[PDB]
């Protein structure tokens, strides 16, 4: 059986606290970066609580956090502060392929305990563009950002993003082409900051997506 701990051990729980509101979800640590959902920044005027197996790190001002936005996708790369303990760089990413067999790798943090698991294997296919890919692995609210991994080679091919109103269809955001290069080539990095959304609804990958279930 494949060992997914090398993946689950890099998962971080993120809590964006701004203007009296909070958005919480998961991310994937890699070197000085944290890969996570773009909607984490529905707001960007507060603090970012980052929890991983290394401990709890808090960013005091999110507005100065350097970010790399992935065109058209619910994915963003965050460059953590210089004094943020770096994650390993063994993780592998790639675009989902036709006939991918996938599983969801998750991690959960409690006050006196913690746990991680890998779901059973299931199938998936592109929704229109391929920005979002449909899947049916059970996902609870709050698990956005959790990695979807290929059963074939252990590569991460996307991060969970959303579900339809009846939770019968789930959707993950696919890793874009040349993603690995993006992580290991500063020249390919487009660092910006202060970016935030202004609406409770967005139109990405051919779907209208709300920040929360109406």
């Amino acid at each position: 059986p494949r060992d997914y701990n090398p993946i689950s051990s890099t998962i971080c729980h993120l809590t964006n606290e701004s203007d009296g509101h909070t958005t919480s979800l998961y991310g994937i640590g890699f070197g000085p970066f944290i890969i996570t959902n773009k909607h984490l920044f529905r707001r960007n005027n507060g603090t970012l609580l980052v929890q991983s197996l290394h401990g709890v790190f808090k960013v005091k001002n999110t507005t100065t956090l350097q970010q790399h936005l992935i065109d058209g996708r619910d994915m963003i790369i965050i460059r953590m502060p210089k004094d943020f303990p770096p994650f390993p760089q063994k993780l592998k990413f790639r675009e989902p392929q036709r006939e991918e067999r996938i599983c969801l790798v998750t991690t959960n943090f409690q006050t006196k305990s913690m746990s991680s698991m890998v779901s059973d294997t299931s199938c998936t296919f592109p929704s229109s563009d391929g920005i979002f890919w449909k899947h049916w692995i059970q996902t609870k609210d709050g698990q956005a950002g959790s990695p979807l991994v290929s059963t074939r080679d252990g590569f991460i091919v996307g991060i969970h993003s959303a579900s339809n109103f009846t939770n019968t269809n789930n959707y993950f955001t696919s890793v874009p082409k040349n993603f690995m290069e993006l992580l290991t080539n500063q020249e390919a990095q487009q660092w910006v900051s202060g970016w935030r959304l202004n609406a409770d609804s967005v139109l990405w990958g051919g779907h209208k997506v709300f920040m929360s279930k109406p």
């Binding site: 909607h39 929704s127 709050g142 959707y171 279930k213």
Partner: peptide, 10 residues
Amino acid sequence: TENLYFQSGT
């Protein structure tokens, strides 16, 4: 395509 909602937490 059906409308969706991000499964981020509170």
